[PDB]
Amino acid sequence: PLKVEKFATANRGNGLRAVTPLRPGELLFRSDPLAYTVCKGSRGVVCDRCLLGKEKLMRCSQCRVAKYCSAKCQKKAWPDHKRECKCLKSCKPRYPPDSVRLLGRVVFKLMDGAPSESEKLYSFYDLESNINKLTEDKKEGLRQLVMTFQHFMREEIQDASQLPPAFDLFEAFAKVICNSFTICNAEMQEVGVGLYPSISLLNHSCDPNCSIVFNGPHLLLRAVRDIEVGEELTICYLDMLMTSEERRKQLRDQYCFECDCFRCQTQDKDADMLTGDEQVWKEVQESLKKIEELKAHWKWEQVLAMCQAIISSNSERLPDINIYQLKVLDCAMDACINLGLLEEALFYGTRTMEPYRIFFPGSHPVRGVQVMKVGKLQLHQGMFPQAMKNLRLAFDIMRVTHGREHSLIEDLILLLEECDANIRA
Ligand SMILES: C[S@@+](CC[C@H](N)C(=O)[O-])C[C@H]1O[C@@H](n2cnc3c(N)ncnc32)[C@H](O)[C@@H]1O
Ligand SMILES: O=C1Cc2cc(C(=O)NC3CCNCC3)ccc2N1
Ligand SMILES: O=C1Cc2cc(C(=O)NC3CCNCC3)ccc2N1
Numbered sequence: 001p002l003k004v005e006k007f008a009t010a011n012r013g014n015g016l017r018a019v020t021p022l023r024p025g026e027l028l029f030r031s032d033p034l035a036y037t038v039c040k041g042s043r044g045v046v047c048d049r050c051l052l053g054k055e056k057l058m059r060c061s062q063c064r065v066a067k068y069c070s071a072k073c074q075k076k077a078w079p080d081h082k083r084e085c086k087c088l089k090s091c092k093p094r095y096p097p098d099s100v101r102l103l104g105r106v107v108f109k110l111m112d113g114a115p116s117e118s119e120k121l122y123s124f125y126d127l128e129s130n131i132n133k134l135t136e137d138k139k140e141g142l143r144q145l146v147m148t149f150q151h152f153m154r155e156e157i158q159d160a161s162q163l164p165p166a167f168d169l170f171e172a173f174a175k176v177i178c179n180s181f182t183i184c185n186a187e188m189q190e191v192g193v194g195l196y197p198s199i200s201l202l203n204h205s206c207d208p209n210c211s212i213v214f215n216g217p218h219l220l221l222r223a224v225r226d227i228e229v230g231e232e233l234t235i236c237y238l239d240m241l242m243t244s245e246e247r248r249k250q251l252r253d254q255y256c257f258e259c260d261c262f263r264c265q266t267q268d269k270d271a272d273m274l275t276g277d278e279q280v281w282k283e284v285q286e287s288l289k290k291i292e293e294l295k296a297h298w299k300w301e302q303v304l305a306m307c308q309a310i311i312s313s314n315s316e317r318l319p320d321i322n323i324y325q326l327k328v329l330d331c332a333m334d335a336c337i338n339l340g341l342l343e344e345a346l347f348y349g350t351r352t353m354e355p356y357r358i359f360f361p362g363s364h365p366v367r368g369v370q371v372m373k374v375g376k377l378q379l380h381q382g383m384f385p386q387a388m389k390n391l392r393l394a395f396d397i398m399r400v401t402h403g404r405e406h407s408l409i410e411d412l413i414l415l416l417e418e419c420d421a422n423i424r425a
């Protein structure tokens with residue numbers, strides 16, 4: 001017997017609930033993806049299988065688009081790449097939308113693949129599509145995806161025979177919109193997209209009681225506070241650095257619902273998020289469109305230059321609690337880490353600590369990882385009392401959000417032991 005179950009909610013479809021009390025940090029479920037792919041910005045920078053960045057990737061010789069860190073990865077990937085390769089070679093110097101490559105892999109994984117453990121609680125067939133809530137604009141976008149898919153797969157899929165029993169491509173793309181997980185690497189960089197149908201049972205809250213974390217493509221679902229018997233299990237679908245208006249847009253546009261959580265009812269934190277001079281934060285918000293695109297493509301030198309122009313502007317500056325300023329600091333910190341500018345990374349990272357304490361309350365994996373980054377930076381600069389405080393705090397968080405089953409916890413424990421050797425009596 002599991003400690004959770006599927007149930008029919010009153011007004012939000014199916015959900016997952018606790019069938020026994022759960023404690024912070026408890027592992028509730030784990031899953032490989034039904035299907036996944038590298039995301040657009042990371043294609044060619046990270047390995048298509050393990051989603052790690054390496055100096056050197058080796059191209060699939062047959063398509064020259066899918067890239068691997070190693071023979072191990074090419075071989076472990078081949079069953080699930082074998083049918084899409086031809087399709088990728090034809091389209092370049094051009095490339096299908098991530099959703100299309102993802103659905104291609106679902107369609108092959110269904111037909112060709114043994115049944116998937118990712119579907120133990122809920123299957124692809126069961127996923128919500130929200131078809132009766134889609135607007136005309138969204139339906140038009142789905143129709144285009146269907147046409148794109150039919151072109152991409154004409155190579156490997158011409159008729160009903162190669163698509164699953166009673167398969168409707170329009171409905172399948174509708175499912176992909178509201179059930180696609182962004183896969184993040186250990187450093188919380190977005191690197192892939194996948195389907196995890198059992199995890200798609202979880203409804204959303206802006207103040208959730210569970211969290212997911214990724215270790216490569218593998219997903220761990222954990223409780224992040226005490227949960228009572230019968231309580232519905234929730235995760236936050238969204239970035240924490242968002243006002244309630246911003247959250248409302250994304251939840252409507254992507255998920256077709258109106259959030260009734262208490263944070264949305266109270267507009268919790270909205271005004272604190274937008275402190276400082278409007279002329280400046282409006283312009284920073286605009287600049288972040290470019291900065292975030294550059295970051296998604298791992299263009300660190302360009303990210304850093306744009307961020308430095310803001311952080312160290314000759315013109316007016318923002319408080320670090322302003323969410324747009326905060327996002328700029330965090331992009332700059334990650335750019336510096338990746339460029340080996342570790343002193344500079346620490347200045348920006350340390351500035352994010354208190355805002356992150358405020359905006360990622362309780363135990364949130366993104367805060368755990370940020371605090372760990374800052375402690376690591378301090379450790380390697382010989383700032384041992386500071387590092388030890390931060391590494392301990394990171395562990396406080398990550399023992400709950402990541403747990404022993406996540407490899408990053410082993411890395412963190414090594415840092416703690418290293419630092420302790422310098423501060424111990
Ligand atoms: C990933 S699925 C979650 C499981 C879903 N309820 C089902 O029956 O398959 C996402 C969809 O669940 C619904 N949903 C999730 N969180 C919600 C919430 N807090 N309030 C209302 N509907 C919600 C929406 O239909 C949304 O598009
Ligand atoms: O069924 C689904 C699909 C889905 C996707 C996400 C999701 O990918 N959220 C992202 C993660 C990276 N930062 C921005 C927000 C979170 C929860 C969820 N449940
Ligand atoms: O095996 C099982 C299945 C199961 C279901 C539930 C259950 O449905 N609990 C309710 C939900 C609403 N509030 C009060 C509690 C509670 C306990 C339990 N043990």
Ligand SMILES: [Zn+2]
Pocket residue numbers: 047048049050051052068069070073
């Ligand atoms: Zn690899």
Ligand SMILES: [Zn+2]
Pocket residue numbers: 060061062063064065066081085086
């Ligand atoms: Zn190939």
Ligand SMILES: [Zn+2]
Pocket residue numbers: 205206207259260261262263264
């Ligand atoms: Zn909400």
